[PDB]
Amino acid sequence: WXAXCPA
Amino acid sequence: AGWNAYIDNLMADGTCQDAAIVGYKDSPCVWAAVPGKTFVNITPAEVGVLVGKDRSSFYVNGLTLGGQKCMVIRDSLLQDGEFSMDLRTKSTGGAPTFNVTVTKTDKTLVLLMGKEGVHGGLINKKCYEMASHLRRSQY
């Protein structure tokens, strides 16, 4: 992700 | 002894200006009340509303007690433990309003309305006490 996790 | 003497006991402290006792069994009628006041004029129809099965109709426009308009605060007459009712008189043109309490016993209904500026809790605690005593006397 963008804000959070890696994705 | 002397049903009127309870009214004297009810008026010992002077925190109330009207007090009465009414037997709600069979034909309702006042057993003792303050002469010339509100509580002396209770009709059986008003008693039937107070002890009636319908516990929601008096929320739409209140009820009348001796012909004087009053609003419902909380209803706990038919619930075990308190058997008590709370009312506040309804007035027009900024006229003074007073707190009204009713306690239900085995045979009687005890009614107290205090003077101006008197908190309802004081009126409630007394009526519960004499109602508690009166039920201990099997009335």
């Binding site: - | 900024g94 003074p96 101006e116 500026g117 008197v118 908190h119």
Partner: protein, 331 residues
């Protein structure tokens, strides 16, 4: 570890609620600032303006011997009647309600009217301008006239020969949605939307052209008129009070009472405000009235005077939904 107030038990509760900001100050300090009519207690003065505080006959008798005859002599009525024995709030009530009760109701009236005028004259002029502009716009709109003529000409076509009237009221426009065709899919107003669009490009969209009518439908004419009319009554009642009423006499006034020193500067300016608002009040009435006959209705019916823009606005939204449904279904 457990650890002579004539005032009623209930009332001590109310006094402490409103004057909480002044707990650290003595009665002598708070008795002084209130007479200044300062901005910091424009809210607390309303609490002492209530009927609850004033309508206390039993205390007024109790604190009467403690009153100071400030009207003449400025001396205590009785001999000693020390005020230190009284409690904190007891000192205030006798020195403010009982002592100044002769002009207390008059002074609060000068201050209650002071607050209401200071904030409503700005908006009241805005409301009366919108209604007058909306009435003039409706009267001076060819588009609104043109659609009514088209409706009348179409309406006379399907009507009988014995009922071929040349005019109708605005309130009759609600019958269009109530008429349906054979399959009930399309109502009478729905034909009008496609009829106007196909052949009358000038009448395609009149809602953006006339917008002030819609906002004018959210205001009550009688309520606004009564609200403004209340201001003039209070103003003229104030004039007879400051000039020839209880406020006129300054002998009963305390030296540290600038209530006379604050109302009089506004007295000249306040007269200007009521004159302008009176002109605007007359302007709205005639501006509504000339456009009122212009469409056949009368203000004598109170509902017609109030529900005049509502009926026009009701047709505006009704035409809007009719057009939206017509466009959605065909596209």
């Amino acid at each position: 570890k457990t650890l002579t107030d004539y005032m009623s038990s209930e009332l001590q509760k109310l006094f402490g609620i409103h004057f909480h900001k002044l707990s650290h100050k003595n009665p002598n300090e708070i008795i002084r600032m209130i007479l200044h009519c300062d901005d910091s207690m424009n809210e607390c003065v309303e609490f002492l303006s209530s009927d609850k505080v004033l309508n206390q006959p039993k205390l007024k008798a109790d604190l009467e011997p403690y009153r100071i005859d400030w009207a003449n002599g400025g001396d205590l009525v009785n001999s000693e009647k020390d005020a230190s024995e009284l409690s904190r709030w007891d000192y205030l009530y006798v020195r403010l309600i009982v002592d100044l009760g002769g002009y207390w109701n008059q002074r609060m009236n000068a201050l209650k009217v002071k607050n209401i005028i200071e904030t409503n004259y700005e908006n009241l002029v805005r409301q009366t301008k919108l209604i007058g502009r909306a009435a003039l716009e409706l009267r001076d709109s060819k588009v609104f006239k043109g659609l009514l003529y088209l409706i009348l000409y179409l309406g006379n076509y399907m009507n009988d020969y014995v009922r071929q009237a040349k005019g109708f009221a605005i309130g009759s426009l609600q019958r269009l949605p109530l008429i349906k065709n054979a399959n009930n899919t399309k109502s009478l107003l729905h034909i009008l939307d496609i009829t106007i669009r196909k052949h009358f490009p000038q009448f395609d969209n009149f809602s953006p052209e006339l917008s002030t009518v819609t906002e004018a439908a959210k205001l009550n004419i009688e309520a606004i008129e009564q609200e403004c009319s209340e201001l003039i009554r209070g103003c003229q009642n104030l004039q007879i009070d400051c000039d020839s009423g209880a406020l006129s006499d300054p002998t009963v006034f305390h030296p540290d009472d600038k209530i006379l020193s604050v109302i009089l500067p506004w007295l000249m300016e306040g007269t200007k405000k009521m004159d302008f608002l009176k002109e605007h009040l007359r302007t709205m009435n005639t501006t509504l009235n000339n456009a009122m006959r212009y469409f056949g209705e009368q203000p004598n019916d109170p509902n017609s005077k109030n529900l005049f823009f509502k009926r026009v606005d009701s047709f505006i939204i009704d035409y809007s939904k009719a057009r939206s449904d017509n466009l959605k279904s065909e596209e």
